[PDB]
């Protein structure tokens, strides 16, 4: 079977990524890092909700995949699949080893799984949605974090969606030509570079 | 904490209330009652001229303050007991086997409950009077009469708990003895 996650909870080792020195690494259990309406413009989903980590620990890719399935299932049931966009912000780049029991001699293990090393304050999941479905997003993320080891807090972001512009100032900056849209995110235009049809505002 | 919390109660004309060391005696017509509240640690006052009963809690948190409304209800029940009394009406409900209830002086016999051969006996304390209504008016009714609400109840409750169905689906087997009317003697 699979070893209990309590054996790989703490960040005891140095980072051990998959490289030309570490071969034979299995694929992570999470492959889809963006569920929901990922193609929605930044104007469509103003509300952003974060799941923030409060401990320095390791989260297995199995737990990450379990969390996103639970969050997607709840939003599809209690809302539509086209009113939210959720992004997993933790990537399992750390490879775990198992000795797989000659006892204790030559005991350097073989790759067994992958996990994400997370710090205090690091964002794990971000949900982009409308203001009408805020209660559903909170419950979906509350259920998803039950799949996570350790303590996490669900907080409401002060920014507009997945951007770095405040919710209180996005619409005013959008009405003026000070914002450049780049898909899910947007960049505030600076008065730098040559005088073009952009950066005039 | 709250410095002063109090509750007030109006005493009717025909009843007198005496308090001494958290021991309340309520005397009116049709009898008298006494309650020992030395476990409460409250301030009980009776205004004899104005016919008011007051209970005060000084410097109390939520738990001690919860007791002064309980005290007022207990004294109010005593006042009602020595002015109107308490009457509990009990009905024997059965599907197939009649519940034969024999009421002698202060003694209750229950027979044929669910066809059982065992006889259920209960001795009513002398402060509570138990009578059986004549079947011509209302079938298989038992009436408990007394001044103390605490004593009149749990005389019917003891009767109810004795006739409990065992090892059967109680949703389907509804036979039992249930209180139906809670009222006053006068």
């Amino acid at each position: 079977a699979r070893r209990p996650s309590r054996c790989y909870r703490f960040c005891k080792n140095k980072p051990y990524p998959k490289s030309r020195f570490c071969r034979g690494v299995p694929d992570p259990k999470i492959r889809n890092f963006d569920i929901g309406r990922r193609r929605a413009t930044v104007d469509e989903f103003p509300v952003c909700i974060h799941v923030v980590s409060r401990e320095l620990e390791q989260i297995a890719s199995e737990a990450l995949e379990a969390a996103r399935i639970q969050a997607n299932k709840y939003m599809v049931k209690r809302a539509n699949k086209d009113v939210f966009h959720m992004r997993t912000r933790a990537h399992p780049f750390h490879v775990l080893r198992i000795n797989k029991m000659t006892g204790m001699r030559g005991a350097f293990g073989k790759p067994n799984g992958v996990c994400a090393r997370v710090r205090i304050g690091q964002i794990l999941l971000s949900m982009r949605t409308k203001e009408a479905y805020v209660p559903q997003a909170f419950e979906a993320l509350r259920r998803a974090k039950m799949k996570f080891p350790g303590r996490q807090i669900i907080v409401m972001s002060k920014y507009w969606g997945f951007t770095n512009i405040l919710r209180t100032e996005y619409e005013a900056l959008r009405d003026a030509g000070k914002l450049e849209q780049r898909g899910t995110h947007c960049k505030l235009i600076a008065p730098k570079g040559k005088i073009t049809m952009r950066n005039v505002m | 904490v709250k410095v002063k919390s109090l509750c007030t109660l109006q005493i009717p004309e025909g009843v007198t209330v005496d308090v001494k060391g958290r021991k309340v005696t309520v005397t009116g017509k049709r009898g008298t009652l006494t309650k020992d509240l030395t476990h409460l640690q409250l301030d009980l006052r009776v205004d004899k001229k104005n016919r008011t009963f007051t209970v005060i809690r000084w410097f109390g948190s939520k738990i001690p303050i919860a007791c002064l409304n309980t005290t007022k209800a207990h004294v109010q029940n005593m006042i009602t007991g020595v002015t109107k009394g308490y009457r509990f009406k009990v009905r024997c409900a059965y599907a197939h086997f009649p519940i034969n209830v024999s009421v002698d002086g202060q003694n209750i016999e229950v027979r044929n409950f669910l066809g059982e051969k065992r006889v259920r006996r209960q001795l009513v304390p002398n402060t509570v009077k138990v009578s059986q209504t004549d079947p011509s008016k209302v079938k298989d009714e038992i009436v408990f009469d007394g001044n103390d609400l605490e004593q009149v109840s749990r005389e019917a409750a003891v009767l109810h708990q004795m006739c409990l169905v065992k090892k059967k689906d109680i949703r389907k087997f509804l036979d039992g003895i249930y209180v139906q009317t809670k009222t006053n003697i006068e």
Partner: protein, 158 residues
């Protein structure tokens, strides 16, 4: 596993700085090294001839020998309970003139200048006063130092 060759563990030690690659310049070639000078022994990785061993990189010593392309430097080295004076042979590209006595040389020259000025009726420069003494302070602007509510909300991300 790990080995101990002459240049072991010098991946970052014997490397040029970013955008500072290249062979030594003319000013290094034109610099004169004499017996008795103080030199810093800093290896130049682009000159793989007469390099010092990695220990002597960053050590300052005294020149004891000058040769057509080489410099002999005496370097102190602690071994167990004592320090040995090790003589190393390097090419001239791996030594820089040390400024370790620049402050002392200036102090000596200032004393000579002060002595000459004092000898023949010159005005000595005024002595600096200590900044740790007392005095009255007249503040042009005075502000209140306090912790505000805005400080606590500003340290919360997202």
């Amino acid at each position: 596993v790990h080995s101990y060759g002459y240049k072991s563990g010098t991946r970052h030690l014997f490397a040029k700085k970013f955008r500072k690659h290249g062979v030594p310049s003319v000013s290094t070639i034109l610099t004169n090294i004499k017996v008795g000078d103080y030199v810093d022994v800093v290896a130049d990785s682009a000159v793989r001839e007469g390099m010092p061993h990695k220990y002597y990189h960053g050590r300052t010593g005294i020149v004891w020998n000058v040769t057509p392309r080489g410099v002999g430097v005496i370097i102190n080295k602690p071994v167990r309970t004592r320090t040995l004076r090790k003589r190393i042979c390097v090419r001239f590209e791996h030594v820089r003139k040390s400024r370790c006595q620049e402050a002392f040389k200036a102090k000596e020259h200032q004393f000579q200048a002060y002595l000459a000025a004092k000898k023949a009726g010159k005005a000595l420069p005024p002595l600096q006063k200590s900044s740790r003494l007392g005095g009255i302070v007249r503040p042009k602007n005075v502000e209140v130092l306090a912790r505000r509510v805005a400080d606590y909300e500003a340290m919360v991300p997202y």
